Amino acid sequence: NKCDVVVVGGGISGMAAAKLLHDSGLNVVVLEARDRVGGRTYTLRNQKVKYVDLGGSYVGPTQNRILRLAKELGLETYKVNEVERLIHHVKGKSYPFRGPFPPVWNPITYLDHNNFWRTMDDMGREIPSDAPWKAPLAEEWDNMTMKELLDKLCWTESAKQLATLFVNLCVTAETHEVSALWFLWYVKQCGGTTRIISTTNGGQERKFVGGSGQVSERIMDLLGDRVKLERPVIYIDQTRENVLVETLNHEMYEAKYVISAIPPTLGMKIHFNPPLPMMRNQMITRVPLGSVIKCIVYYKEPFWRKKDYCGTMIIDGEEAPVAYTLDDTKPEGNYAAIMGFILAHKARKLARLTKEERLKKLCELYAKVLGSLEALEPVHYEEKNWCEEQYSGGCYTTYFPPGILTQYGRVLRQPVDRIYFAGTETATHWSGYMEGAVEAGERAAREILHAMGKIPEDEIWQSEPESVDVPAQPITTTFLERHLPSVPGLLRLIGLTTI
Amino acid sequence: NKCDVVVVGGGISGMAAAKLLHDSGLNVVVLEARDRVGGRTYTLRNQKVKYVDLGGSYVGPTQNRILRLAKELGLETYKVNEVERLIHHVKGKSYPFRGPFPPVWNPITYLDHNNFWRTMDDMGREIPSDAPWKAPLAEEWDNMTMKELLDKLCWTESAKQLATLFVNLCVTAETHEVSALWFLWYVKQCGGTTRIISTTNGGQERKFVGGSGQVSERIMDLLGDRVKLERPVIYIDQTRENVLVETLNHEMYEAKYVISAIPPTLGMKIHFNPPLPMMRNQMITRVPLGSVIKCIVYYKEPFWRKKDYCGTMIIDGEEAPVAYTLDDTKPEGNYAAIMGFILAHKARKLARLTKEERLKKLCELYAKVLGSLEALEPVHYEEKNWCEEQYSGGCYTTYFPPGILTQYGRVLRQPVDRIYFAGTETATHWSGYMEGAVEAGERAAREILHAMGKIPEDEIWQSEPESVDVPAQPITTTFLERHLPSVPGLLRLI
Handedness of CA B355, B357, B359, B362 (dihedral sign): negative
Rounded Cα–Cα distance for residues B352 and B358 (Å): 10
Residues with Cβ within 8 Å of B133's Cβ and at least 6 positions away in sequence, in order, are B142, B405, B406, B409, B410
DSSP code per residue over A109-136: HHHHHHHHHHHHHHHHHTS-TT-GGGST
Residues of A in contact with B271 (CB under 8 A): 232, 234, 248, 269, 390
Nearest to B118 by CA among B48, B192, B186, B175: B192
Rounded Cα–Cα distance for residues A443 and A252 (Å): 26
Q: Within a 13 Å sphere around the CA of A398, how many CA atoms are in the beta-carbon half?
A: 28
Q: What is the largest CA-CA distance in chain A?
A: 81
Residues of A in contact with B176 (CB under 8 A): 143-144, 402-403
Q: Which of A177, A197, A217 is the last residue of a domain?
A: A197
Quick one: closest CA in A to B235, which residue? A248
For chain B, the first-to-last Cα distance in angstroms comes to 75
Q: Do residue B138 and residue B93 come from a single domain?
A: no
* Burial class of A109 by CB neighbour count within 10 A (0 to 12, 13 to 18, 19+): middle
Closest CB from A271, A282, A388 relative to B269: A271
Nearest to A382 by CA among A398, A359, A360, A362: A359
Q: Do residue B202 and residue B157 come from a single domain?
A: no
Q: Are B195 and B430 in contact (CB under 8 A)?
A: no
Is residue A240 situated within a structural domain?
Answer: yes
Rounded Cα–Cα distance for residues A102 and A86 (Å): 8
Rounded Cα–Cα distance for residues A293 and A383 (Å): 7
Instruction: Give backbone dihedrals phi and psi of B263, rounded to 5 degrees, phi first.
Output: -50, 140
Rounded Cα–Cα distance for residues B148 and B160 (Å): 11
Rounded Cα–Cα distance for residues A152 and A144 (Å): 11
Q: Do residue B91 and residue B56 come from a single domain?
A: yes
Q: Give the distance, in angstroms, between the CA of residue B373 and the centroid of all CA atoms in the same chain.
A: 33
Q: Within a 13 Å sphere around the CA of A388, how many CA atoms are in the beta-carbon half?
A: 13
Is residue B474 situated within a structural domain?
Answer: no
Closest CB from B388, B402, B407 relative to A345: B407
Residues with Cβ within 8 Å of A228's Cβ and at least 6 positions away in sequence, in order, are A29, A30, A31, A32, A247, A251
- Chain A contact probe: residue of B133, B141, B145, B251 with most A CBs at under 10 A: B145
Q: Are A277 and B388 in contact (CB under 8 A)?
A: yes
Q: Give the distance, in angstroms, between the CA of residue B431 and the centroid of all CA atoms in the same chain.
A: 7
Yes or no, beta carbons of B393 and A174 under 8 Å apart = no
The CATH number of the domain holding residue A416 is 3.50.50.60
A67 Rama sector, left if φ>0, alpha if ψ -120 to 50, beta otherwise = alpha
Number of helices (H) and strands (E), helices first, in chain A? 17, 20
Rounded Cα–Cα distance for residues A174 and A343 (Å): 9
Is residue B127 situated within a structural domain?
Answer: yes
Nearest to A259 by CA among A389, A443, A432, A130: A443
Rounded Cα–Cα distance for residues A281 and A283 (Å): 6
Neighbours of B237 (CB within 10 A): 16
Closest CB from A176, A235, A275 relative to B403: A176
Taking one residue from A and the other from B, the number of pairs with CB-CB distance under 8 angstroms is 124
Q: Any idea how long chain A is?
A: 499
Quick one: closest CA in B to A280, which residue? B388
Q: Do residue B182 and residue B248 come from a single domain?
A: no
Nearest to B493 by CA among A178, B102, B485, A446: B485
Q: Give the distance, in angstroms, between the CA of residue A331 and the centroid of all CA atoms in the same chain.
A: 23
Quick one: closest CA in A to B176, which residue? A143
Q: Do residue A229 and residue A272 come from a single domain?
A: yes
Rounded Cα–Cα distance for residues A97 and A92 (Å): 16
Yes or no, beta carbons of A281 and B387 under 8 Å apart = yes
Instruction: Tell me the nearest-neighbour CA distance from A247 into chain B, angstroms.
Output: 10
Instruction: Give backbone dihedrals phi and psi of A392, rounded to 5 degrees, phi first.
Output: -125, -45
Range of the domain at A315: 40-60+77-105+198-208+288-400
Is residue A160 situated within a structural domain?
Answer: yes
Yes or no, beta carbons of A177 and B402 under 8 Å apart = yes
Q: Which of A377, A400, A423 is the last residue of a domain?
A: A400
Strand pairing category for A324-327 and A337-343: antiparallel
Rounded Cα–Cα distance for residues B344 and B174 (Å): 6
Neighbours of A73 (CB within 10 A): 17
Nearest to B99 by CA among B107, B90, B89, B87: B87
Nearest to B17 by CA among B280, B260, B263, B284: B260
Q: Which of A400, A415, A443 is the last residue of a domain?
A: A400
Yes or no, beta carbons of A389 and B281 under 8 Å apart = yes
Q: Within a 13 Å sphere around the CA of A333, how many CA atoms are in the beta-carbon half?
A: 3
Q: Cα separations (Å) of B296 from B15, B45, B58, B378, B383?
A: 27, 13, 14, 10, 6
Rounded Cα–Cα distance for residues B17 and B7 (Å): 8
Is residue A219 situated within a structural domain?
Answer: yes
Rounded Cα–Cα distance for residues A235 and A251 (Å): 11
Residues of B in contact with A351 (CB under 8 A): 278
Rounded Cα–Cα distance for residues A99 and B132 (Å): 45
Is residue B476 situated within a structural domain?
Answer: no
Resolution of the coordinates, Å: 1.8
Residues with Cβ within 8 Å of B320's Cβ and at least 6 positions away in sequence, in order, are B89, B365
Nearest to B348 by CA among B304, B436, B288: B288
Instruction: Tell me the nearest-neighbour CA distance from B43 into chain A, angstroms.
Output: 21
* Burial class of B360 by CB neighbour count within 10 A (0 to 12, 13 to 18, 19+): middle
Nearest to A441 by CA among A128, A59, A11: A11
Q: Find the DSSP H helices in A333-433.
A: 345-350, 355-369, 404-408
Q: Are A263 and A392 in contact (CB under 8 A)?
A: yes
Q: Are A307 and A370 in contact (CB under 8 A)?
A: yes
Rounded Cα–Cα distance for residues A340 and B351 (Å): 47
Quick one: closest CA in A to B149, which residue? A148
SS3 call for B326: strand
Q: Do residue B292 and residue B387 come from a single domain?
A: yes
Q: What is the 3-state secondary structure (H, E, C) of B340-352?
A: EEEECHHHHHHCC
Neighbours of A211 (CB within 10 A): 23
Residues with Cβ within 8 Å of B460's Cβ and at least 6 positions away in sequence, in order, are B443, B446, B447, B450
* Burial class of B357 by CB neighbour count within 10 A (0 to 12, 13 to 18, 19+): exposed
What is the DSSP secondary structure assignment for residue A354, as one 8-state letter?
A: -
The CATH number of the domain holding residue B301 is 3.90.660.10
Residues of A in contact with B249 (CB under 8 A): none
* Burial class of A443 by CB neighbour count within 10 A (0 to 12, 13 to 18, 19+): buried
- Print burial letters for A172-193: b (CB count within 10 Å at least 16), e (below 16): bbbbbbbbbbbbbbbbbbbbbb
Strand pairing category for B271-273 and B233-237: parallel
Nearest to A187 by CA among A432, A454, A495, A486: A432
Q: Do residue B396 and residue B438 come from a single domain?
A: no
Q: Give the distance, in angstroms, between the CA of residue A230 and the centroid of all CA atoms in the same chain.
A: 25
Q: Do residue B22 and residue B152 come from a single domain?
A: no
Rounded Cα–Cα distance for residues A352 and B22 (Å): 38
Beta strands in A14-92 (DSSP E): 28-31, 43-44, 52-53, 77-79, 85-90
Yes or no, beta carbons of B147 and A145 under 8 Å apart = no
Strand pairing category for A380-385 and A227-228: unpaired
SS3 call for A62: coil
Nearest to B172 by CA among B319, B293, B51: B293
Q: Are B99 and B107 in contact (CB under 8 A)?
A: no
Rounded Cα–Cα distance for residues B359 and A212 (Å): 56
Q: Are B97 and B151 in contact (CB under 8 A)?
A: no
Q: Find the DSSP H helices in B232-344.
A: 278-283
Rounded Cα–Cα distance for residues B42 and B213 (Å): 5
Residues of A in contact with B282 (CB under 8 A): 288-289, 291, 387, 393-394
Residues of A in contact with B148 (CB under 8 A): 148
Rounded Cα–Cα distance for residues B22 and B15 (Å): 10
Q: Any idea how long chain B is?
A: 494
Instruction: Tell me the nearest-neighbour CA distance from B177 into chain A, angstroms.
Output: 6
Rounded Cα–Cα distance for residues A261 and A17 (Å): 8
Q: Do residue A280 and residue A409 come from a single domain?
A: yes
Nearest to B12 by CA among B220, B206, B196: B220
Rounded Cα–Cα distance for residues B431 and B180 (Å): 16
Quick one: closest CA in B to A236, which residue? B248
Yes or no, beta carbons of A176 and B143 under 8 Å apart = yes
Quick one: closest CA in A to B385, which residue? A278
**A280 residue type, one letter:** R
To the nearest 10 degrees (0 to 180), the angle between helices A434-451 and A64-72 is 80
Dihedral angle, C-alpha A353, A358, A361, A362, nearest 10 °: 160
Q: Do residue A187 and residue A241 come from a single domain?
A: no
Q: Within a 13 Å sphere around the CA of B76, how many CA atoms are in the beta-carbon half?
A: 3
The CATH number of the domain holding residue A170 is 1.10.405.10
Q: Do residue A191 and residue A202 come from a single domain?
A: no
Yes or no, beta carbons of A174 and B403 under 8 Å apart = yes
Q: How many domains does chain A have?
A: 3
Q: Are B401 and B367 in contact (CB under 8 A)?
A: no
Is residue B487 situated within a structural domain?
Answer: no
DSSP code per residue over A256-295: SEEEE-S-GGGGGGSEEESPPPHHHHHHTTS--B--EEEE
Nearest to B447 by CA among B188, B245, B224, B261: B261
Q: Are B9 and B435 in contact (CB under 8 A)?
A: no
- Chain B contact probe: residue of A244, A272, A285, A410 with most B CBs at under 10 A: A285
Rounded Cα–Cα distance for residues A304 and B124 (Å): 52
Is the peptide bond prior to A396 cis by the omega test (within 30 degrees of 0)? yes
Residues with Cβ within 8 Å of A224's Cβ and at least 6 positions away in sequence, in order, are none
Q: Are B111 and B487 in contact (CB under 8 A)?
A: yes
Nearest to A42 by CA among A215, A289, A298: A215
Method in brief: X-ray
Q: Do residue B410 and residue B270 come from a single domain?
A: yes
Is residue B491 situated within a structural domain?
Answer: no
CA angle A255, A258, A262 (to 5 degrees): 140
Q: Are B198 and B204 in contact (CB under 8 A)?
A: yes
Q: Within a 13 Å sphere around the CA of A353, how many CA atoms are in the beta-carbon half?
A: 18
